[PDB]
Amino acid sequence: MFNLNTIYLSRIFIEFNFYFLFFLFLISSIIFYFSKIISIQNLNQNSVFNFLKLANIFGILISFFIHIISFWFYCIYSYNLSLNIFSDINLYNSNSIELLNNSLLPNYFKSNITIDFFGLILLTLAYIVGFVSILALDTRLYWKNIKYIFSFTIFLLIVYVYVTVSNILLFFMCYELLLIPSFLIVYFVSPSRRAIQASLYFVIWTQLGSLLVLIAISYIISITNTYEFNDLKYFNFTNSESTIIIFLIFLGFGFKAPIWPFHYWLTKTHVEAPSGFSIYLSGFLVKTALYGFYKFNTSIFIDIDSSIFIAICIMGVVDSSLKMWGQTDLKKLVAYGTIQEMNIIYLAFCWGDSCAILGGILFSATHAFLSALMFFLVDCIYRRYHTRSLVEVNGILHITPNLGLSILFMLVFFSGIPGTIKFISEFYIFSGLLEASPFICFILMLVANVLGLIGFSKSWFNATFGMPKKNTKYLPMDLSFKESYIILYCFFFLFIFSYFSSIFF
Amino acid sequence: SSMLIWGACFGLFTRAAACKASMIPLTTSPWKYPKYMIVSAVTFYYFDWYRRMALEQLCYNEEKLERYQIRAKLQSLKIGEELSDAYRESFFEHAVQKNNI
Amino acid sequence: AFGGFRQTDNSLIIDDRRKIILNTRSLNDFQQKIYLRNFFTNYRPDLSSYDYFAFKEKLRIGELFLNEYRKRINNEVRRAAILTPTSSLREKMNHKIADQILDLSSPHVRGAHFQAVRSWTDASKIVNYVEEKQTKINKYGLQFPLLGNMTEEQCASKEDEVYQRLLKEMQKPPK
Amino acid sequence: MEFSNALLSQTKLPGQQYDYKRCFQASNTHFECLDSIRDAYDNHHKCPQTYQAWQSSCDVGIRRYQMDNREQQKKDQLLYSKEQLKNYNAAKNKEAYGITAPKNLSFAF
Amino acid sequence: SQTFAHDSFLGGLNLFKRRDPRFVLDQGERPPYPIINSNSSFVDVLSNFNKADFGLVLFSAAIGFPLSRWVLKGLTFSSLNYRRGLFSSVYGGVILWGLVLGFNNSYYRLNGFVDNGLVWKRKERKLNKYDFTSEFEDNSFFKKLRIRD
Amino acid sequence: MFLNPVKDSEFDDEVKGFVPSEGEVRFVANKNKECGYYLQGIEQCRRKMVQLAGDSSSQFHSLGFLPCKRLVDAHYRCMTDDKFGSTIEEVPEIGLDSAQKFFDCTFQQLKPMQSCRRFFDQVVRDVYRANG
Amino acid sequence: MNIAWKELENDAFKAKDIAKFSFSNASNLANFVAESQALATNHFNTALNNGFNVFFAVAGLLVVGVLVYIFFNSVGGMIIRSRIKAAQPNPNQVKVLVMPFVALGVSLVISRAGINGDDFGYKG
Amino acid sequence: MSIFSNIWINNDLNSYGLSILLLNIINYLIVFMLILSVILLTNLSKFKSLNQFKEFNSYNFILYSLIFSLLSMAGIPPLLGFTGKFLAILYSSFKSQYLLILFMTILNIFGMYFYIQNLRFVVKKNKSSILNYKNYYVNINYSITLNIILLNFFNFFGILFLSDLIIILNYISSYIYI
Ligand SMILES: CCCCCCCCCCCCCCCCCC(=O)OC[C@H](COP(=O)(O)OCCN)OC(=O)CCCCCCCCCCCCCCCCC
C-alpha cells in the first residue's frame, strides 16, 4: 500500500528541515548583529546572549525532532523502492516514476537531494552529539567570545549539505568546510594555555590529509570531466590510476580518522581542548572521514590487495590498545580508546562494498555515544575536583556516588555486555575477520579486548575507589540533573538502538 | 532574483557592517545608507551585463581558437609524419585545398 | 566529455580489427578508452544500468534466501531435538536432514561472512533461482502486500486472472 | 606563437603600410562577383578580373583572413537559420533557470 | 540599434556604444562603416573636426571644474596664488584630455571605426549563435550601449 | 530475462533458468557500448515525433514514426556488425518474434525505453546463438 | 537535422513497415506526451500540497509544544515551581499540563497517519 | 584532439592555464592588499619582530580580519587563497604532471605551517593599543575600514562568485593566439 504520498513526504521533510535550520540561523545572526554595536556580551540580566542561547538550543532540539520523523520516512521509502524493482518480473513494464519539485523553496546549490542510510546515520549523530556538546559549553562562553554559540548550527548545516548531495565536488567542499570552526573553537574557547599549539598541530595534520584527498579529487575530476557519482559507472580507471587514487584517499582520510602513524595531533588536541569540543571531535567529526572514504571507495573499481591497509589499521588498533596501561590522565586514556575503536571501524571499509560495511556503520554510532559519555564523565570529574589525573583524585565513590556509579556502568558498556550495540558491532566485524583471517582475528581480539581493556579498567577503577582524605574543605557535590539525564540518555540510546530495524545493518 | 535589488541589499549590509567595524553607532550619518544601496545596485547591475557579454565573445573566440589548434597540431608533427598515411590526407587538405587565397 | 591520462610505458599495440599499429605512450583520450579502459567491472556487463540494479538487488535477496534456508533447517533440527528423544533422534535426523544440513554449509551458503565468492555464472544462477521462485509466486498473486505494491484497479484484474488459472488447473486430468 | 596566422599577419617589413580603403573596395567587388554564383568550394577563376584586382590590392595575410572567415561563414550558413537559433537561445536561457538532475538507472549504456 | 548622429554636439557619445567587447578588430576584418581616409595624416584628422569633437571639448570643460575642485580639496599650507595656479593647471590638463578625445574621435570617423554617416553597400551577415545578452539588454538600460544586440 | 519454459510441466507456467556463454555476454556488452548512440536517439526521436504530430489533424500524421525507422535500422546494423542485413526486416527467421515484441513495446505501447532494450537485446542474443 | 518529414512518402515503404511504424490511438499519444502513463500531474500536485501542509503542521505543533513546555517548567527550583503552580487557577494548571502534550501527540499522530496507507480500497 | 575521416575534434581549451595563472596572481594580490590595509589602519612602528603579531590583538575587527587573512594565505579551504591552489593542482592533473603536483604539495604544506605559525604569536596578555592618536583620541579610519569590509566579504564568500572571474579571465586569455 505504498504510494506517492510517502515519497513526497520524505523528500519535502528532507529539504524543509534544512531550510528551517537555515532560517533559524539567519534570524538569530541578524538579531545578534543588529542589536548592539560591538556584538559582545553586556554582562547584565537583559543580554541578548540569553536569547541567543535558548534559540540555538531550541533549534537543534526541534530540528532533531523533525529529523527523527524525516528519518523514519526515508526508511520506509527506501524499503519500498527496492521492492518496486524486485517484483517487476514482467518484461514489458519497468518502474518509470518521475517526480516534481516543490514550489516554495529553491534547491540549495542547484542540486537534487539524494540520501542514503549511512548519511542519515551521520546526520543523526551530528544532531545528538552537537546537542550534548553545546550543553557542555555553557561555562566556557562569556564576555567577548559568545559568538561561538553559533558553531554547532553551522556544523549541522554543513553536514546536512554534505550528506544530501550526489555532487562529488560539493561533497569535497563540504568536507573541507569543517576545519575553520573547529580551529576557532579550540583557539578562542579553550582555557588551557597549551591549547594554542595544539590547535596548530590539529590544523597542520588535518590539512595534510585534506591535501592528499584534494590531489585524489583533482585526479578524478580532471580525468573524468564530471561531478556526478553516476557518470563514474561509464568510465574505467587503469591499474595505476586506481592504485594512486586508493592510496591517496586512504592516507588522506586516515589523517583525520586517525590511523596508526598519525594520531599525535588527536592526542594533543584532546588533552588541551575544551570538554564540549572534545565530545564533538571524538563523537562526530572523525566520522566525517569514514563517510567520504566509503563513497570514493565504492564509486571506483580497484584491483589491488587490501592487505597493506588492513595491516595499517590493525597496527593502529594494537598500538593504541597497548598504550592504555601507562596513562594517568583520564582524557588521554579516553583519546586512546577513541583511536583504537576508530581504527577498528576503519578496518571494516577495507573490503569494498561487501557486507563488512554494516558493522562499521553501526560501530560508528556506537563509538559516537561511548566517546561522548566518556568525555562527559571526564568533564564532570575535572569540574568537580579541578583535576583529571589519577595521582591527584581517587575515591570518586563514597563522595558524590552517582559519578562513580556512572563510571562503573560506562566501564561495563565499554567492555561490551551482550545486551548493547557494542557487542553487536564486535560480533559483525569479528565474524567477518575470523572468516577472512583467523589468526589475525584472534590476535586483534586478544590485544584489544584483554590488554587494552585491562589498562583502561585499572586506570578507571583506581580513580573510583579509595578514600578521599586530602581536602575535605573543598570536596564537591554530586551530579546535577543535566549531567544525570545526559548519561542516562547515552545508556538508553545504546540499549534501545540494539532494537533497530534489521532491514538495514 | 534581480541584480538591482541584490546590489541594493549588498550596500545596505555593507554600511551596517562598516558601522560595526568602526565601533561607531548605527543610525549615524544616515544619508550614507541610500547612497550605498544606489552605488552598489548600479555596480553589480553593470557587472551582470559585462559577464554575460564576455561569454558571447569568449564563445566566438573559441571558433577561431578551433582553427588555430588544428593548424598548430599539423605544424608540430615530427618530421616524417607529414606524409605518413595517418596525417597525409589532413595535411594535404590544408596545403592544397586551403590554398584558396 | 570523458578525458584521460597520458601514458608512460612504451609498448606496441596491434589492432587487427582496424588494421593499425599504435604505441601506448602516444595514445590520445579516445584511443585510451578503447584500448586501455575497455575491461568489464560487472557480473553482467550485457545488462543496462536499470537491469543491473535489478540483478544486484535480486542477488542480495538470493544470498539472504540461502541464509534463510540454513536458518529453517536449523530450526527444524531444534524442533526435532525437543520433540524426539535421543533414543531415536540420531537415526531420524540421519534420514534426509543431515544431508540438507551439509548442503547448506560455508561455501554453498554465505552465512556470516563478509562476501560470498561467486563467479558471474554463479551469480546468474542464484538470480535465476530467485526469479523462478518469483514467477511461481507471482502467477498466484501471493505477493501483493508482502513483496509488491499494486493499485486497487490492478488487484481486481489480478484476482480474476488467479481465479481463472485456478479453475484451469483444477479441471486438468492428473499426471 | 609561431603557429598562428593572426600573429604572423601582424608582422610586416619596415616602412610597409596597408591601404585598407582600396583593399576592402576590391574585396567587396570580388565577393559580389562571387556569391552570385554559389559553389561549395569558391572558384576565383570564374571571376578573373575581380580576382586579379583583389590579388593586386590586398596583402597575403588579409586575403588569408578573408578566406578563413568566408569558409567559416559558408559552413555556418548551411547549418543554422535565424529563427531556429533564436528559439534555441531562448530555450537554453529558459532552462538555465532550472537545475540539472542525474539520470539514474539509464538504458542506453 | 540606433546611434547618436555624427557632426552634432552629442556625437562623441557614440564612443561609448559598441558591438563587441573587443579593443580592436582583426588584421583583415572590415570596419563597421565605410572608410574615408585609411592612411590619414595629422592635418587630415584636424580638418575632419566638427561639432562632435567640439562637444567633447565642451564636456571636458564642464566636467573639469568639479574634478579640479576635488583635487584642490587636498591642499594644505598653501597661499591664494599657489591655489589658483594649481586649479588652473588641473583645469588645463582636463581641457587637454578633452582635446585628445576629440582628436581620437575624428581619427576614428576617418577610419570608419565609429558612425561617420555612411553605410556599407553590402551588410556583413552574422548568425547570432551564442546569445546571453539580447533579452537582458532589452529589459534594461544596456540596450542603449549596445549596437545590433 | 534468462528463463526457458518447462515442457510437459504438471502446471501451466513453470520455468528453468540458464546462463549465457561468456562470448555472448562479451558481444552484447561490446555492441551496447559501441552503439548506444543510436539507442538514445530512438528515445529522443520517438518523443519528438509525437510532439509535432500527436494530434490527428497534422499534415504528416499518416507517416507516424517513419523517420526514426532509419535510426532503428542503424542500431540493428551496429548490433549485428553489418554481417546480416542493412535493415531490421532482413533479420533471420530466428529472433523475428522478438523483433515484433520490440516494435510492439516501443511504438504501439509507448513504454519507457527500459523494457524495449530487452527485446532488441533478445533479437541480438537469438542471432548470436543461431549463427557464429 | 536530417531526421524530419520532408521528402517522406508512404509509396517507398511497404505497408507492413508502415503498420509497425504508425501512431497509436489518441489516448496513448496523449498519455505519452503528458507523461501520464501511470500517474497524473494532478496526483503529483496533490501529493506536493499534502506534504507541504503536513510539514508545516508538524513543525508548528512541535515548536509550540516545546516552547510551552520549557516556559512552563523553567520558572525556578522545585519548591518555587510547586508554589507557582499552587497559586495558579485551575484552568491555567489544566492548560499548562495538557496543551504541550496535545501539540506533541498531534504531531506524532500526523506522522503515523503519514506512514500508514489505510485508504486502500481492496478491503473485504 | 582526435581525428575521424579528416575531421578534427578537440575538447581542450589550450588557454586555461594562462587564466589559472592570472587568477592565482590576482587572488594573492587581493589577500596581500587586505593584510596591508589592516596594517595601514594602525600605528606602523609597532610591528618589527615576528612575535609582535600580538600587537594585532586590539579589537575584534583587526584581530579576526588578520586571522582570516593569514588563514587565506595558508590556503585554508573556505577562504579565497585556497581556490587558486586548488585550480593549480586541477590543471596540473589535467596536464598529467604528478611530479609537479608532489613538489607543489611539499611547498604548500611547508608554506602553510610557515603562515599558521604566527597565529600562536597573536596571543597577548592584554589589549595591544596600536592606534594613532589625533585630537587626544585614537584615530580610527572609516574608509580603510570599509575597504577591509569589502575585502573580507570577498575573502569569505569569493568561492561563490569565482565562476564569473574565471569566465572573464578565460575571455581575456582566449585572445593570446586567436
Ligand atoms: C537604478 C538603475 C537604473 C538602470 C541602470 C542604469 C545604469 C547606468 C550605469 C551603468 C553604465 C555606465 C557606463 C558603463 C560603465 C563604466 C565603464 C566600466 O565600468 O567599464 C568596465 C571595463 C570596460 O572594459 P571593456 O569594455 O572590456 O574594454 C575593452 C574594449 N572596450 O571593464 C574592464 O575593465 C574589464 C575587466 C577588467 C578585469 C576584471 C577581472 C580581474 C580583476 C578581478 C578582481 C578585481 C579586484 C579589485 C581590483 C582593482 C579595481 C578596484
Tab-separated table of C-alpha atoms in Angstrom, chain D:
chain	number	residue	atom	x	y	z
D	1	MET	CA	53.104	31.913	-31.065
D	2	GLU	CA	54.981	30.559	-34.112
D	3	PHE	CA	51.816	28.786	-35.295
D	4	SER	CA	49.080	31.440	-35.571
D	5	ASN	CA	48.346	33.188	-38.851
D	6	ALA	CA	46.900	36.092	-36.848
D	7	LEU	CA	50.225	36.978	-35.225
D	8	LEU	CA	52.199	36.370	-38.425
D	9	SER	CA	49.870	38.686	-40.359
D	10	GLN	CA	50.782	41.490	-37.945
D	11	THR	CA	54.464	41.053	-38.872
D	12	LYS	CA	55.447	43.466	-41.635
D	13	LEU	CA	58.546	44.886	-43.260
D	14	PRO	CA	59.854	48.243	-42.021
D	15	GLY	CA	58.216	51.031	-43.966
D	16	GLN	CA	55.306	48.813	-45.039
D	17	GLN	CA	51.765	50.181	-44.771
D	18	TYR	CA	48.332	48.927	-45.804
D	19	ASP	CA	45.739	50.881	-47.793
D	20	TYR	CA	42.601	49.472	-46.192
D	21	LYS	CA	40.177	51.500	-48.327
D	22	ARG	CA	41.400	50.141	-51.672
D	23	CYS	CA	41.804	46.608	-50.318
D	24	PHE	CA	38.284	46.481	-48.901
D	25	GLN	CA	36.804	48.015	-52.058
D	26	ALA	CA	38.494	45.342	-54.177
D	27	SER	CA	37.474	42.583	-51.757
D	28	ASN	CA	33.838	43.720	-51.758
D	29	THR	CA	33.807	43.882	-55.559
D	30	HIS	CA	35.330	40.400	-55.833
D	31	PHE	CA	32.954	38.904	-53.265
D	32	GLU	CA	29.993	40.411	-55.121
D	33	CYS	CA	31.304	38.993	-58.393
D	34	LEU	CA	31.222	35.789	-56.373
D	35	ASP	CA	28.183	34.992	-54.196
D	36	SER	CA	26.098	35.489	-57.339
D	37	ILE	CA	27.189	32.037	-58.469
D	38	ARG	CA	27.229	29.759	-55.427
D	39	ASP	CA	29.580	26.791	-55.059
D	40	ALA	CA	30.627	24.613	-52.144
D	41	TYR	CA	34.251	25.486	-52.963
D	42	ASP	CA	34.935	29.017	-54.177
D	43	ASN	CA	36.483	29.181	-57.656
D	44	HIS	CA	38.226	32.507	-58.236
D	45	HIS	CA	38.889	31.688	-61.901
D	46	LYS	CA	35.179	32.241	-62.609
D	47	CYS	CA	35.697	35.919	-61.647
D	48	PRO	CA	39.077	36.640	-63.265
D	49	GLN	CA	39.270	40.451	-63.350
D	50	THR	CA	37.963	40.892	-59.799
D	51	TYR	CA	40.329	38.115	-58.703
D	52	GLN	CA	43.287	39.971	-60.223
D	53	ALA	CA	42.245	43.259	-58.611
D	54	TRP	CA	41.818	41.515	-55.246
D	55	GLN	CA	45.255	39.902	-55.529
D	56	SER	CA	46.937	43.172	-56.509
D	57	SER	CA	45.126	45.235	-53.842
D	58	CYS	CA	45.103	43.194	-50.611
D	59	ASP	CA	48.030	41.729	-48.697
D	60	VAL	CA	48.513	37.983	-48.314
D	61	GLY	CA	47.604	37.993	-44.619
D	62	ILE	CA	44.410	39.949	-45.265
D	63	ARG	CA	43.470	37.518	-48.038
D	64	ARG	CA	44.128	34.527	-45.768
D	65	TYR	CA	41.930	36.026	-43.051
D	66	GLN	CA	39.224	36.783	-45.622
D	67	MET	CA	39.245	33.216	-46.960
D	68	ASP	CA	39.140	31.750	-43.446
D	69	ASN	CA	36.211	33.995	-42.497
D	70	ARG	CA	34.402	33.178	-45.747
D	71	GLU	CA	34.834	29.441	-45.174
D	72	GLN	CA	33.525	29.761	-41.615
D	73	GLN	CA	30.525	31.798	-42.798
D	74	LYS	CA	29.698	29.298	-45.550
D	75	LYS	CA	29.902	26.437	-43.052
D	76	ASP	CA	27.655	28.280	-40.588
D	77	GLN	CA	25.026	29.218	-43.186
D	78	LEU	CA	24.419	25.615	-44.271
D	79	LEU	CA	23.632	24.563	-40.683
D	80	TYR	CA	21.705	27.377	-38.987
D	81	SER	CA	18.895	29.861	-39.536
D	82	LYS	CA	17.960	32.989	-37.609
D	83	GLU	CA	14.617	31.734	-36.288
D	84	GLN	CA	15.816	28.350	-35.033
D	85	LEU	CA	18.891	29.987	-33.493
D	86	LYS	CA	16.642	32.455	-31.666
D	87	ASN	CA	14.378	29.645	-30.453
D	88	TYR	CA	17.343	27.565	-29.271
D	89	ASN	CA	18.865	30.532	-27.432
D	90	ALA	CA	15.544	31.311	-25.749
D	91	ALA	CA	15.075	27.675	-24.716
D	92	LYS	CA	18.614	27.432	-23.328
D	93	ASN	CA	18.269	30.679	-21.370
D	94	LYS	CA	14.906	29.457	-20.069
D	95	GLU	CA	16.246	26.104	-18.866
D	96	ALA	CA	19.261	27.826	-17.297
D	97	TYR	CA	16.921	28.996	-14.519
D	98	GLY	CA	16.257	25.377	-13.544
D	99	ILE	CA	18.615	22.695	-12.297
D	100	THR	CA	20.113	19.526	-13.773
D	101	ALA	CA	19.224	16.180	-12.257
D	102	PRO	CA	21.104	12.879	-12.602
D	103	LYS	CA	19.604	10.310	-14.968
D	104	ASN	CA	19.561	7.420	-12.517
D	105	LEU	CA	19.107	3.895	-13.913
D	106	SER	CA	19.648	4.709	-17.579
D	107	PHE	CA	19.163	2.340	-20.513
D	108	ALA	CA	21.387	3.463	-23.377
D	109	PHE	CA	24.718	2.321	-21.931
